[PDB]
Write a protein that binds this ligand. Sequence first.
Ligand SMILES: CCCCCc1nc(Cn2cnc3ccc(Cl)cc3c2=O)cs1
Ligand SMILES: CCCCCc1nc(Cn2cnc3ccc(Cl)cc3c2=O)cs1
Lengths: 203, 203
Amino acid sequence: NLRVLLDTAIPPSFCDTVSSVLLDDFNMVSLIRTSPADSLATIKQDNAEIDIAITIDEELKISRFNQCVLGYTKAFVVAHPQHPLCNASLHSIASLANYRQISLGSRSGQHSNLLRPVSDKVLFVENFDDMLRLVEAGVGWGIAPHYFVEERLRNGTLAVLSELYEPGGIDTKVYCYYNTALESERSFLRFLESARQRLRELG
Amino acid sequence: NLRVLLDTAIPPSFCDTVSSVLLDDFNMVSLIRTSPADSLATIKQDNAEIDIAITIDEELKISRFNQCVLGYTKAFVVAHPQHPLCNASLHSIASLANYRQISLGSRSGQHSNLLRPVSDKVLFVENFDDMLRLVEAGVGWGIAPHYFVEERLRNGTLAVLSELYEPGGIDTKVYCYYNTALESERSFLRFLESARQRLRELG
Ligand SMILES: CCCCCc1nc(Cn2cnc3ccc(Cl)cc3c2=O)cs1
Ligand SMILES: CCCCCc1nc(Cn2cnc3ccc(Cl)cc3c2=O)cs1
């Protein structure tokens, strides 16, 4: 039995590749969705017995676990098109720390440097659906994955703020935290190259 | 008079692009090399009167300054080809925390999460030249820029350890920390697009 954790931030394409590739070697394979804010929090509970975690969140070294880079995914800072910062000027990028941010909440109450909110006006949510509902209502701005907002951006229901910060959207390493045990086992090495080599063909 | 700080980690190609593009708008332009470990440390000294810093190092928010992404550069974990971890196995990646690392030193004694050493056996240096001299002598392993080790890798004087962690080498955002003042001035906006658009054509 293999237990795999996936961030809600991890595109559903990546999830399709991971899941497929594992069934070639593994007989029981349990997939588990988690807020990016609860990913590492979860694997560090020993009882939760997670073997692999695919998450965007970064923490240097963890008990029992090793890190590596599966690939890259995009993220945009999004607001209601009528949002004051809609012009997305270079002063507006500094003024994001002034305006209400709709940030992801941590069950642990604690955030990493990456996922910690930037502004003092913060309204926490559990998932990106809740985030974008509030952002569509112009209640604030938020940082969400590409696949979650591709739909709404073309439909014009949402606008981007991030282009002057990082043109093309904010590149984000998808990390693979694997139980130290698996490093020797070639079952995992197959999965890693295979998943990487497929995720590379998406890119 | 414009004062620009550049990391020793910033490729000399990037430096050629930055410097060129600035002279199109600016009449005095002072270029200043710094260890990645001393980049942010420097700009936060108010007397140093830095206007722009191009560095790989990351710190969320700084007094007087705004952040943005100029582009991406590569970095490899390198050792003497005869180094015990030469096989670069997945257990060897975990065992880097056991072996002597030749890390960059901070004049402030403090490191960011990014540039803080990983192993307990650490031998600090001021620059990548010192790092790679010691690494060629097999004294330890180190993390250095692509352009610094491209020469030695082909010549076989050095070996790579990083490929299982991140195939292709370790992607690293080149940040542009600019004095908040410049956000309005179109002189800077020209430079940013121009530098990005040229650094993109290198990629
Ligand atoms: C100028 C506005 C951008 C600064 C603020 C940033 N935030 C980050 C970290 N961050 C956070 N939330 C995410 C959610 C989803 C995804 Cl896919 C990525 C991320 C992410 O990178 C970087 S850059
Ligand atoms: C498995 C070995 C890799 C883990 C250890 C890492 N270290 C980092 C931060 N880091 C540090 N030193 C640099 C020097 C030069 C350049 Cl161009 C980049 C960097 C860098 O990213 C990431 S990954």
